[PDB]
Design a protein around this nucleic acid. Structure first.
Lengths: 88, 153, 177
RNA sequence: UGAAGACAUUGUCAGGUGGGGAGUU
């Protein structure tokens, strides 16, 4: 058993998009996360994974919904940052 | 089978009153929900707490009594022995109601209608409802000497 | 000093979620319009206020040594490890708690796993391998670890049976003295 | 036309830092 990271295994296009890939052995630019909104999105996923299985259908929906609102706020915040930087 | 049929009709009426928000019936409905929640399926028990939270959030958007009525019901739901033993399994956390009761204490002081007034939920005085919530948080029937000291303070 | 990337923040919070409940409270805004952030300085993660972080930028990176509270370090293989320097954070919002008696506090501070004879108070409905914070009878946090058995299964265990695996103890402060 | 208020905001020099952005060997 050996890690796929250790082997130089090409990345494959699937239902999950590969996106823009980065060359190996080069500067993969650090994308810092420091906003409260960006931290909230990551935190919601972590909490959802730890909680795991919930028997209630409504309680399961609410856990998914709070991640959706966290994503929406982060996207709105980053959009406003782009507009301010582009305009001013 | 007949119990299931009656439970279907009894609970359907309870929820349709909650959706339409009849002011003179919500106290009676919440007593029924607290009385008969342990007779229904487990997965619906967590839904009842979530439905209570939406009612409180709607009133957060008279109004003081309705939010206190739901908070009394939520604690009375968990004070049952069956629901208490299923706390961990069914993910029944009352942290939302404890926090909401905490942020409302300052506003309730300024309210002048606190005194304009065998039941456990349907009580005519908002001050009485406040005392029932406070007794649940600070003097629970179960685990009375394991309560977090910070919450008490 | 630089803030965390999105991969690193996920790793740090995953380890913290193993031990604490309300991680939203960690990064929630304060009264004076300030908040706590995460910073990396020589593969060590630091929990510190944003105002302190901004005014600590004047110090050159080769001249900075500590900042706020140190949660732990990222290992060479990319794996976050908590340190006892993070215990005050862990105890504030601990999910599962274990209390050890006087006969178990001293062995724990020397670096031994808790056994049944040491436990004086459990936390009911605690799964097998969960993160717990260890206290003594005076509610003084001694450290943290991972539980060996479930609470129900630990009750029927032998007195000389491991109930918690040690991961950090306050005696490590004597190490770096 | 009303409100706040000589405080903010903003601007100019001198610095500290800069694992981020641009360029060069």
């Amino acid at each position: 058993v050996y890690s796929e990271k250790e082997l130089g295994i090409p990345q494959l296009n699937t239902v999950t998009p590969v996106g823009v890939t980065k060359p190996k052995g080069k500067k993969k630019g650090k994308v810092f996360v420091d906003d409260r909104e960006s931290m909230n999105t990551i935190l919601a996923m972590v909490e959802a994974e730890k909680q795991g299985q919930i028997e209630s259908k409504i309680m399961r929906a609410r856990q998914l919904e709070e991640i959706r609102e966290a994503r929406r706020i982060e996207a709105e915040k980053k959009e406003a940052e782009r507009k301010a930087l582009l305009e001013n | 089978r007949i119990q299931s049929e009656i439970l279907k009709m009894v609970f359907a009426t309870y929820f349709r009153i909650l959706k339409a928000r009849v002011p003179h019936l919500m106290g009676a409905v919440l007593e029924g929900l607290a009385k008969y929640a342990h007779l229904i399926n487990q997965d619906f028990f967590g839904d009842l707490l979530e439905a209570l939270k939406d009612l409180i959030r709607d009133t957060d958007r008279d109004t003081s009594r309705e939010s206190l009525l739901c908070t009394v019901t939520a604690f009375a739901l968990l004070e049952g022995q069956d629901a208490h033993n299923a706390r961990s399994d069914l993910h029944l956390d009352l942290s939302f109601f404890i926090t909401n009761l905490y942020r409302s204490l300052l506003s309730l002081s300024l309210n002048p209608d606190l005194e304009l007034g065998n039941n456990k939920i349907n009580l005519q005085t908002t001050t009485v409802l406040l005392l029932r919530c406070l007794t649940s948080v600070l003097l629970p029937p179960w685990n009375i000497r394991s309560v977090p000291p910070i919450r008490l303070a | 000093m630089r803030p965390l990337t999105d991969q690193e923040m996920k790793i740090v919070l995953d380890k913290l979620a193993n031990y604490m409940t309300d991680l939203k409270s960690l990064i929630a805004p304060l009264e004076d319009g300030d908040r706590y952030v995460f910073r990396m300085q020589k593969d060590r993660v630091y929990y510190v206020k944003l105002s302190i972080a901004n005014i600590a930028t004047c110090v050159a990176r080769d001249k900075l040594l500590s900042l706020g509270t140190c949660l732990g370090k990222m290992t060479k293989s990319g794996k976050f490890r908590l340190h006892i320097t993070a215990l005050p954070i862990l105890a504030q919002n601990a999910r599962y708690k274990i209390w050890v008696k006087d006969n178990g506090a001293q062995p724990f501070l020397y670096g031994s796993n808790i056994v049944k004879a040491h436990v004086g108070r459990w936390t009911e409905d605690c799964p097998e391998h969960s993160g717990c914070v260890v206290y003594n009878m005076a509610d003084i946090p001694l450290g943290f670890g991972v539980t060996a058995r479930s609470t129900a299964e630990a009750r029927r265990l032998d007195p000389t049976g491991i109930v918690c695996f040690r991961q950090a103890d306050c005696g490590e402060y004597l190490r770096d003295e």
